[PDB]
Each structure stands twice: as C-alpha cells, then as structure tokens.
Amino acid sequence: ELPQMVQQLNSPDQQELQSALRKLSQIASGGNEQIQKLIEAGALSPLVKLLDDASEEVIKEAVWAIANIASGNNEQIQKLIEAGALSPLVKLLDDASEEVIKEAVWAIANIASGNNEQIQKLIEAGALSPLVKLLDDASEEVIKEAVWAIANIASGNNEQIQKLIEAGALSPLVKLLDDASEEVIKEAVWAIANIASGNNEMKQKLEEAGALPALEKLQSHANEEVQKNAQAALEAFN
C-alpha cells in the first residue's frame, strides 16, 4: 500500500520506480485527503529528491505530482516547501525541456497561490527572474501558465509586487496585451490588475510601462470577457 510505494521511490530498478511514481501521481490528483495520506506516509522528501534524477521521464512525473500536491491547502503547500521543493523547481525553469517547464510553472503558480510568506519563499528561491524570462522566450502554451504564476505573485503584498517589477515583469506583460492570443491577453490583464492595486509608485511604473493605452485600446476587443477584465484593471488603477 503507501509505505511500500514510498520505499519504491528510492528503488534501483527504474521500472518499479516509474510505476511507483505513477501510482503516487494518481493519488496526488485525488483531492486533499488523498494528499494528506501522501504527506503522512513520507512521500514528499523522496519525491522532491527525484527532481534531480538523470531522466526527465522520472522528473516530469514527479513535477506533475508536486503540482497536484500544491493544489491542496496551505498547510499542505507548507509541507512541500519544507521538503525543499522550491529550489529544484526553480532550477527546472531554465535547465529542462518546455514539456517539463510547463509542469514546473504550474507547480510554482500553485505554491504562489498560498499565503504571502509562501510567496516570499518562492521569491527567495529565485523564481521571479526565470519566470519573467519565459514570457519572451517560451511557447504561448508555456507563457500562459507563466503569466498565471506571475499574477499570483502579484496578489501578494507591495514589497512582493516591487520585486516583480525589479525582475522586469512590466514590459513583457504590457507587450502581451497586444502581440498574443486572447487566452494570454486575459491572463496578462489579470496580472496587471493585481499590480495596479499596488501603491502609487507602482501605478506610476505601470503608467510608465505603457499599460494605460494598451488597456484602454484593447478594452474594446473582439472578446468582450477581456473587455470586462480590462475595465476592472483600469478601475483598479484609479
């Protein structure tokens, strides 16, 4: 049952490992009571220790599970942070395939959907720069999940939003309001709306970055659900 699967994550046979990992992912996508059993069975440390395995075949699977475990409550996110997950996840954002990175980004967004202290831990782990870089360098698919990670960071407190700005988030975000697909624009405006709820220096940084014309312009857009959200980003900007 669970302790045997956990023991198997450190197995020397790659097929029993890989099959163990897959069972664990299954459980980890089973809602918060299922996640609680993984935590209480000791799964979390060995799982995170797999983020350094030689094949991305193991790694992808371990990140997918971690993404799901971070969908749980904030106490559960906290256990993931204590098991050391942040550093290897951040490391994957530049040293791994786009396939893995999408999963890493998803994991990281969910962790950032935790409380402010947990968002602080993501920053200290150096998340902000590789996330921002993805916005210029990655496929629209990956960019869409990165923008959502960035937005969750932007819902944190003012010191946190200033760190994003320092990491260069503004111009790439502003640029996404135009030269991108409608699903990405939506994600981008939501991130900007969060920033726009900042203090007056940040608004000003927002205005400097060219945000207001882009929001005014493409409020009146084919999709009228973005109209609505573009609206509220301007209202939030005061």
Binding site: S29, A70, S71, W106, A109, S113, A151, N194
Partner: peptide
Amino acid sequence: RRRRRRRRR
C-alpha cells in the same frame, strides 16, 4: 489582487 489555485485530474 486575484490569487488562484489549480488542481488537475
């Protein structure tokens, strides 16, 4: 400020 967790099946 919107803040969003996604679980995946």
